[PDB]
Ligand binder design. Sequence first.
Ligand SMILES: *[C@@H]1O[C@H](CO)[C@@H](O[C@@H]2O[C@H](CO)[C@@H](O[C@@H]3O[C@H](CO[C@H]4O[C@H](CO)[C@@H](O)[C@H](O)[C@@H]4O)[C@@H](O)[C@H](O[C@H]4O[C@H](CO)[C@@H](O)[C@H](O)[C@@H]4O)[C@@H]3O)[C@H](O)[C@H]2NC(C)=O)[C@H](O)[C@H]1NC(C)=O
Ligand SMILES: *[C@@H]1O[C@H](CO)[C@@H](O[C@@H]2O[C@H](CO)[C@@H](O[C@@H]3O[C@H](CO[C@H]4O[C@H](CO)[C@@H](O)[C@H](O)[C@@H]4O)[C@@H](O)[C@H](O[C@H]4O[C@H](CO)[C@@H](O)[C@H](O)[C@@H]4O)[C@@H]3O)[C@H](O)[C@H]2NC(C)=O)[C@H](O)[C@H]1NC(C)=O
Ligand SMILES: *[C@@H]1O[C@H](CO)[C@@H](O[C@@H]2O[C@H](CO)[C@@H](O[C@@H]3O[C@H](CO[C@H]4O[C@H](CO)[C@@H](O)[C@H](O)[C@@H]4O)[C@@H](O)[C@H](O[C@H]4O[C@H](CO)[C@@H](O)[C@H](O)[C@@H]4O)[C@@H]3O)[C@H](O)[C@H]2NC(C)=O)[C@H](O)[C@H]1NC(C)=O
Ligand SMILES: *[C@@H]1O[C@H](CO)[C@@H](O[C@@H]2O[C@H](CO)[C@@H](O[C@@H]3O[C@H](CO[C@H]4O[C@H](CO)[C@@H](O)[C@H](O)[C@@H]4O)[C@@H](O)[C@H](O[C@H]4O[C@H](CO)[C@@H](O)[C@H](O)[C@@H]4O)[C@@H]3O)[C@H](O)[C@H]2NC(C)=O)[C@H](O)[C@H]1NC(C)=O
Ligand SMILES: *[C@@H]1O[C@H](CO)[C@@H](O[C@@H]2O[C@H](CO)[C@@H](O[C@@H]3O[C@H](CO[C@H]4O[C@H](CO)[C@@H](O)[C@H](O)[C@@H]4O)[C@@H](O)[C@H](O[C@H]4O[C@H](CO)[C@@H](O)[C@H](O)[C@@H]4O)[C@@H]3O)[C@H](O)[C@H]2NC(C)=O)[C@H](O)[C@H]1NC(C)=O
Ligand SMILES: *[C@@H]1O[C@H](CO)[C@@H](O)[C@H](O)[C@H]1NC(C)=O
Ligand SMILES: *[C@@H]1O[C@H](CO)[C@@H](O)[C@H](O)[C@H]1NC(C)=O
Ligand SMILES: *[C@@H]1O[C@H](CO)[C@@H](O)[C@H](O)[C@H]1NC(C)=O
Ligand SMILES: *[C@@H]1O[C@H](CO)[C@@H](O)[C@H](O)[C@H]1NC(C)=O
Ligand SMILES: NCCc1c[nH]cn1
Ligand SMILES: [Cl-]
Ligand SMILES: [Cl-]
Ligand SMILES: [Cl-]
Ligand SMILES: [Cl-]
Ligand SMILES: [Cl-]
Lengths: 334, 334, 334, 334, 334
Amino acid sequence: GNMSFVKETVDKLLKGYDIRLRPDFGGPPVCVGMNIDIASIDMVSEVNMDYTLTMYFQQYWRDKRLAYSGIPLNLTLDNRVADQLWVPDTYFLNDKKSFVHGVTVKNRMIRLHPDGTVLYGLRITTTAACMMDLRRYPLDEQNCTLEIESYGYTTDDIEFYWRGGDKAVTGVERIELPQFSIVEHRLVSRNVVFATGAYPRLSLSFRLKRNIGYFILQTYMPSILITILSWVSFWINYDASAARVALGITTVLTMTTINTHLRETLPKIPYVKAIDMYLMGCFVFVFLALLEYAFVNYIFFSQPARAAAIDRWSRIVFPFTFSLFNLVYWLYYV
Amino acid sequence: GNMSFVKETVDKLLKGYDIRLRPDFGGPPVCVGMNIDIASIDMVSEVNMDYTLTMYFQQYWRDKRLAYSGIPLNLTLDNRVADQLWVPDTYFLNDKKSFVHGVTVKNRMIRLHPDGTVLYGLRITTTAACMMDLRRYPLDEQNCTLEIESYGYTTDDIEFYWRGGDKAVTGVERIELPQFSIVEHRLVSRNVVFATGAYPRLSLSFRLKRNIGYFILQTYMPSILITILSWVSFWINYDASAARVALGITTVLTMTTINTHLRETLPKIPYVKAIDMYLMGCFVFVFLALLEYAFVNYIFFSQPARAAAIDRWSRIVFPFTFSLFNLVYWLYYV
Amino acid sequence: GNMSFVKETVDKLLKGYDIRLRPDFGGPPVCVGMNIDIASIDMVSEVNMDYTLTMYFQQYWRDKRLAYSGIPLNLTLDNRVADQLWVPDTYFLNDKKSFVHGVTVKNRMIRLHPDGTVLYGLRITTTAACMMDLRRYPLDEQNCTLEIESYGYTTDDIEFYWRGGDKAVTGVERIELPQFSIVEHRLVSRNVVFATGAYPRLSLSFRLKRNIGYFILQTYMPSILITILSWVSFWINYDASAARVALGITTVLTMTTINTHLRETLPKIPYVKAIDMYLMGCFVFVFLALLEYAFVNYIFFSQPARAAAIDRWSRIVFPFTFSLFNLVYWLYYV
Amino acid sequence: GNMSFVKETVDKLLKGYDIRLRPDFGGPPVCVGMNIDIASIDMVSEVNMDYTLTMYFQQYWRDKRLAYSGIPLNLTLDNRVADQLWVPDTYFLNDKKSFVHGVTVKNRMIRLHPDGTVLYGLRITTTAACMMDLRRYPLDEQNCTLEIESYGYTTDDIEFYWRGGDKAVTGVERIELPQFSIVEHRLVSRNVVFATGAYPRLSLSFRLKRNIGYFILQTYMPSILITILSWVSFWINYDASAARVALGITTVLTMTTINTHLRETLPKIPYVKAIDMYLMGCFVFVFLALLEYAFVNYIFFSQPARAAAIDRWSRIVFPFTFSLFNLVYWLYYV
Amino acid sequence: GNMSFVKETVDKLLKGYDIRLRPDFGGPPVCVGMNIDIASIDMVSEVNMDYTLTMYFQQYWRDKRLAYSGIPLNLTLDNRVADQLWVPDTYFLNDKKSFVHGVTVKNRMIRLHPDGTVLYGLRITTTAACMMDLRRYPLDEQNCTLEIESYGYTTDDIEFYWRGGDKAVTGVERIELPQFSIVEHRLVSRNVVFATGAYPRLSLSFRLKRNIGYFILQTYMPSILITILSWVSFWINYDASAARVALGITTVLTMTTINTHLRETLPKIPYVKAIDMYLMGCFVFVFLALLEYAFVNYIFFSQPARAAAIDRWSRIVFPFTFSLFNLVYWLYYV
Ligand SMILES: *[C@@H]1O[C@H](CO)[C@@H](O[C@@H]2O[C@H](CO)[C@@H](O[C@@H]3O[C@H](CO[C@H]4O[C@H](CO)[C@@H](O)[C@H](O)[C@@H]4O)[C@@H](O)[C@H](O[C@H]4O[C@H](CO)[C@@H](O)[C@H](O)[C@@H]4O)[C@@H]3O)[C@H](O)[C@H]2NC(C)=O)[C@H](O)[C@H]1NC(C)=O
Ligand SMILES: *[C@@H]1O[C@H](CO)[C@@H](O[C@@H]2O[C@H](CO)[C@@H](O[C@@H]3O[C@H](CO[C@H]4O[C@H](CO)[C@@H](O)[C@H](O)[C@@H]4O)[C@@H](O)[C@H](O[C@H]4O[C@H](CO)[C@@H](O)[C@H](O)[C@@H]4O)[C@@H]3O)[C@H](O)[C@H]2NC(C)=O)[C@H](O)[C@H]1NC(C)=O
Ligand SMILES: *[C@@H]1O[C@H](CO)[C@@H](O[C@@H]2O[C@H](CO)[C@@H](O[C@@H]3O[C@H](CO[C@H]4O[C@H](CO)[C@@H](O)[C@H](O)[C@@H]4O)[C@@H](O)[C@H](O[C@H]4O[C@H](CO)[C@@H](O)[C@H](O)[C@@H]4O)[C@@H]3O)[C@H](O)[C@H]2NC(C)=O)[C@H](O)[C@H]1NC(C)=O
Ligand SMILES: *[C@@H]1O[C@H](CO)[C@@H](O[C@@H]2O[C@H](CO)[C@@H](O[C@@H]3O[C@H](CO[C@H]4O[C@H](CO)[C@@H](O)[C@H](O)[C@@H]4O)[C@@H](O)[C@H](O[C@H]4O[C@H](CO)[C@@H](O)[C@H](O)[C@@H]4O)[C@@H]3O)[C@H](O)[C@H]2NC(C)=O)[C@H](O)[C@H]1NC(C)=O
Ligand SMILES: *[C@@H]1O[C@H](CO)[C@@H](O[C@@H]2O[C@H](CO)[C@@H](O[C@@H]3O[C@H](CO[C@H]4O[C@H](CO)[C@@H](O)[C@H](O)[C@@H]4O)[C@@H](O)[C@H](O[C@H]4O[C@H](CO)[C@@H](O)[C@H](O)[C@@H]4O)[C@@H]3O)[C@H](O)[C@H]2NC(C)=O)[C@H](O)[C@H]1NC(C)=O
Ligand SMILES: *[C@@H]1O[C@H](CO)[C@@H](O)[C@H](O)[C@H]1NC(C)=O
Ligand SMILES: *[C@@H]1O[C@H](CO)[C@@H](O)[C@H](O)[C@H]1NC(C)=O
Ligand SMILES: *[C@@H]1O[C@H](CO)[C@@H](O)[C@H](O)[C@H]1NC(C)=O
Ligand SMILES: *[C@@H]1O[C@H](CO)[C@@H](O)[C@H](O)[C@H]1NC(C)=O
Ligand SMILES: NCCc1c[nH]cn1
Ligand SMILES: [Cl-]
Ligand SMILES: [Cl-]
Ligand SMILES: [Cl-]
Ligand SMILES: [Cl-]
Ligand SMILES: [Cl-]
């Protein structure tokens, strides 16, 4: 109630305070318990091999230099006072661009407790790198991790743990990814040894499964229908050479245009993927259909009966071979 | 009139002032009344699932430490003095990137009143996230919200309300969205409970209806005309096999090119939409027209009368089936 | 000549100076005269509905607290001293992103005069929003404004005027817009009333006329030539069904490809424009040509004379109808 | 050797130093000699009409307030001391975005000399605007300038010169532009008069010649080959109406696709260029070939001899007319 | 254990400390040993001719002014104390945009040792320029270097060396480039002479070999198959003029579309590359096939036997010539 007394207490707490020294400097390591409240996952980029994540990152520790008596209340201070206190050098190992929101003020919270306990909250949007294995794209399953580490202090000076256990990270169920579904999330705590010593490490891992309905409707069905249209030329009478030539070469042209526009629309992934293999298979099928028609046209004059036999064998074989190819493709990747 | 007296009064106000402590610290919560004057909505991005908004955000509260007597005037101070005063830790829950304009100076206003009242104005451009359900795109209706919350202080330390009631937010009628029309806007005040306690919450919601004229003129009419051109082959005499083959396969090629270029131009939305369903329906219709012509050509030699009957039945059926499909599509999504 | 005396004078000027108080605080409003020297207009974006502008913005006012005697010279001070003086809270009403150049130093100039006059110059690159009516695009004429306002001070505390009258803004004739020509520029001074009072307002308006030669050469001529090629099928003998079918459907395909690629290249404007109407007209013309050929082919067997009559009527009508359409289009939009 | 003595000397130099006053304030202007060591030219953008340049910019001047005695050595100080010294208000007239590199520290160098001489070095990446005349693109030759000026000080307070004469700017020969070759570079020194007085001006001009091999291989050869393929129809027998119709209309389609994709790939330049004229000429040639074939087909029945004469005249004329067009094009632009 | 004693020792160390003076100022140069722990290589851009690299950059030196006694421990201080100490002016010669990560705090580490030794660690993401010779693209091998230099201090004031020898740079084996494989990395130490004297220089060079499987599957195979389809017309009977004309011109159209879409997808490299040469060769082959068919069609009437001989010679020659072209191409670039 008396703001002058509270100001005197805070000034006494900050009088002689050395921000350059960690709590219990030269003694036992200071334990920092961390919790994450995930607000959203903005995007998951395959081209950049990363994902954007917005979260409330809260750190919990104890500094006996900040213990105060006579006030039976928790002191929620202005965020600017965080510039006058020691804070852990927590950073994200795999991030590429991170920032703290600063509207209207810096998205930062400092709460002090009578026993010297400090709660330090930040709102962070971080773009964390995620190496994605896109061999099975778009039927792939990815695993993206956020790594939390101390930068300068070793395990002799600081220790990390998930405050609250498996419930340390919340808001995962509220994540709305249009293209992915979060199968599972895991929390890991360990120590990692580098040339400068052992450092604490926390890990938050998500497992994402990609949705396939959009790719099925927009990437596979046109190719299947173009392959069927390529088959259509088999039932066309072989006397109409111009009609069958036009049909085959125009199916080839449609397949080429579809492949090029899909490659333009699909993420710029410079290695072989499942959808690329399927498109190549469809292109090879239409190419073989055109070659078969060419052979039939060439051998028609010498022996029309053999040409008709080849035509009917193509009618009975091409759908069967394509069905076998599709069965192999959809059993290998599923 | 006497600037020395005003300077003395301001120095006395700021002498002993503790920015780390909220007004009435340890007592009743400080009530903050907020008003928004929307200048513009820059863009609404479906790919990024967000919208950019520029506004004048004004906060109104009372700090008895700033009460001054002897000056029967309101003191409009330089914005820099805002760095020497306590301000609410107001932030936007769903924003992704926000900034305060700083040309020529920081777009900030501090006005003091004799009773200790503080008016604090900012000009903020914020990119607020908006989860959009694009199943009915481009006939969709969206609801985008701006959430305002206190970051560190709970409801025991601060309370939010819309100053002016339903007239707290102005400038909505002046918003000029080229692709959307603002059907309605709503103001909500409530409290939200998290693990750290209850926090005040204000919500400003807009309901947007997308315009359809551009999509009708540029996305549906070409598909309808290509479907009609596919129908055209039915009246063409079946003796000209090459002509009908070329017409059908070229209609298929035009449909594929139109679909690919629309997908390139349309926002990168990785799930099924209404326009995708319409394009797939048109593609299926032209595919079925080509298949019907192939069947007629195959059965023409064995029984020309049956081929002619199938041709005339196609003439009478394909427009009817397409009309039924269009009626179902335009009654389901409207 | 004596730098020690000048330093003493400047220190005396800045001794007891209160930056939180405007000149003549509590008295008459301080008049600020503004001049703009436009260096360039970087770009004019229709998609973003804005324009980038680089300028030298100079403010002129009087502060009696800075009046000095004994030095018969104007004091051009280091720009950093601007952080120790009161400056107007001038901002741009319609800007979206503005910055002051800072290489090698902050592009800022402070000049003091013996009578207390202050000249304050900045080099500002501002992206000002401009709502563009693109119904007549690319034959449109736009009007883009830059609005200058005081943020916190009302008309009782500050007044704005164009220093130099109509010659306040210079460098307009030197602006080199590749796609636009500046027809006129205007200067407006007024007062605008908001809920917090009346504020001064300056307005600098440009009228831009878009160049049409690029669009005429690259957007209209291909469509006209494709329409003529569609007409070409009328003179082709109707016995060659395959040739006319191929010509018509390939003209349709070329028109579709041209329209799609123009839409990709043209700015992403989500409403109807003049060029879209012209492209739709050309597409409708080629569609009607193909339909007419189909009708002629259908009725050729029953009555060849009527088919020939329809063919010659098409020959005499289609160019005439297209000429009427072009005349209406080029008289409506010009 | 004695760091305490050096620290005492530096403190004495900075004791009573007024950064707000230029050297020899109120007397003769301070002469600043400038040298540039160009590290690279990152890019030259026609769409943005600018070029990115990284350089070491060194300024040389004399400040008698910094003269020190007793130390027969040059004092290379930490860059942070530059914040405690007067520096020229040097800026780039035509730049759009410039910054000083700040990793690991700010890329800044301060060197003091016993006679008060100051050497001040910065590493600056500046995007300087360059108005490019693209009428002769891609056979164009451009001239891009970097302008250096004092912002606040006139010629009565500061003077600029190129330290070292024509050898002031180095590293030009090491510039590796993939698309341009630096024909020449020039240094200019002058004074420019504005409403606020006369200001010193330095200018560094580069003359760039664009390479043509990529455009010759990828932009002209396909058009020439498509024109030859259009000519091919002349030797095809006129009895095959379908074959010649298909060849002509497909050459037109290929030309349209090539033009559209080149326009997409080429920089977004909204006015007529040489390559656009060449593409239009090729398109007109194929259009005229198709029209000639149509006329031959129309007049074939009435008088086959005249049709054959027109066909052979086309065979002998079209290559000749195209050769004349190419000769005019390659003599006008070379 | 006693934090007050440690604070007293640190204050004594920083009392009288001059950050403007290097260690051993006026004496022997200070030796700085540098180590790099590469975390990742984000991207390698051919269009921008650069590569993004994230690393832990650690500098090791000795400052006798920071030597402390009585504490038999290494002092890991808060990163902010780095603003109160002298640090080397280390910068990257070829970088374009670099930054130090600042979440949650600035990614910076200061460790002091009793003998005055300072370890200074930063986490830096730098976009270093790399001039790439893309004549053999996509079969090219590149060499990208990171150059480390002192900005202001010469070799008389500072010396650089790789601390740990060839093991100074770690984490190279963990680099996961989707499109490149790191063949080798090298460390170089030398001195470079400029007009201002001799400066130390460290160099970290990577040799990258581009993967070819994606280009083989997606860029060469379609062209080869289209060339084979162009050959297909040779076996087609020459009586069907329309069929062969359509096949040849549609193969030309497919080749043009493939080339244009590859150019759109491929990096914007404005000079000749190997893949461009291969595409031009395939286009020339299909063009020659169409020309040969045209010649056969022209000479068929006068002498069918010669036309058949030319057709069979084309059948036996075109695959052979294409095989020779492919052998030359794949032996020249491999
Ligand atoms: C995405 O991919 C990452 C890997 O790249 C996965 O991360 C791994 O997750 C597993 C758990 O699913 C981790 O395994 C566990 O590690 C714990 C930590 O081990 C360290 O610390 C202990 C001391 O506390 C040391 O002894 C040890 O050497 C390590 O230094 C262990 O404590 C766990 O052991 C417990 O469970 C196992 C069974 O799982 C029992 O057998 C044990 O007795 C004990 O009860 C366990 O081994 C693994 O370390 C993680 N790897 C990395 C690199 O972080 C993500 O899980 C994955 N994403 C998803 C969604 O799965
Ligand atoms: C976009 O979508 C959002 C939701 O995602 C919509 O937001 C909802 O808007 C409605 C109003 O249209 C809100 O409903 C109202 O909430 C008020 C607040 O309730 C809180 O506080 C009270 C105490 O003050 C608590 O008791 C309560 O549990 C909550 O914690 C209520 O006060 C309102 O009740 C009043 O009106 C109703 C009728 O509407 C009466 O029955 C009541 O008696 C009373 O008079 C009301 O319930 C809702 O809370 C909002 N949801 C969220 C999540 O914010 C947007 O409206 C939508 N956009 C548009 C344009 O509609
Ligand atoms: C782009 O579009 C904008 C509008 O969106 C145009 O801006 C308008 O420009 C016109 C001038 O061309 C302005 O009209 C003038 O306004 C002056 C200011 O009026 C205010 O202040 C006075 C007191 O000084 C008040 O009485 C008044 O109510 C306003 O608050 C007037 O002083 C002018 O009047 C003078 O000229 C008129 C004739 O034009 C005479 O009849 C009068 O007697 C008097 O001599 C005049 O009315 C208009 O205000 C501007 N509008 C806005 C919103 O700024 C741009 O011009 C346009 N771009 C281009 C290139 O034209
Ligand atoms: C890209 O384009 C720019 C222009 O947009 C070119 O810049 C011009 O470069 C020429 C030189 O090639 C400049 O001409 C020279 O200007 C000097 C400066 O003149 C100013 O200062 C003097 C006093 O010192 C005043 O008298 C004068 O009025 C100016 O204010 C002159 O000193 C030069 O004169 C000398 O050479 C000429 C012959 O060239 C002799 O006749 C004279 O007697 C004397 O010896 C000369 O006139 C020109 O000023 C530049 N223009 C601008 C706007 O900067 C770039 O050169 C071009 N890029 C390339 C690569 O060429
Ligand atoms: C990418 O491309 C760059 C060049 O652009 C390559 O960098 C070169 O790497 C080679 C090593 O592979 C360097 O050659 C070595 O330079 C050392 C430094 O020389 C300087 O300093 C010495 C004094 O210490 C001076 O005498 C000398 O004049 C230089 O100023 C030498 O010490 C090395 O010599 C040793 O090895 C050679 C054999 O290699 C022996 O003959 C010598 O006796 C001695 O033992 C050696 O010459 C070269 O300097 C680098 N060039 C540049 C510009 O940095 C990268 O290697 C390449 N990338 C990859 C992966 O290879
Ligand atoms: C509030 O605390 C101050 C500082 O200790 C003290 O001087 C003052 O008397 C207190 N107020 C009351 C009402 O006791
Ligand atoms: C310059 O001014 C200072 C301060 O007033 C004074 O002490 C000094 O004597 C003056 N110099 C001369 C030459 O008068
Ligand atoms: C170094 O300079 C300081 C300051 O002048 C002085 O006190 C000290 O004695 C000098 N050192 C020596 C060895 O003379
Ligand atoms: C810790 O160091 C301080 C400062 O030297 C000293 O006053 C204090 O007595 C020390 N503590 C102990 C337990 O000796
Ligand atoms: N122009 C004063 C600030 C403002 C405008 N609208 C609302 N607030
Ligand atoms: Cl932000
Ligand atoms: Cl801004
Ligand atoms: Cl800048
Ligand atoms: Cl940088
Ligand atoms: Cl970062």
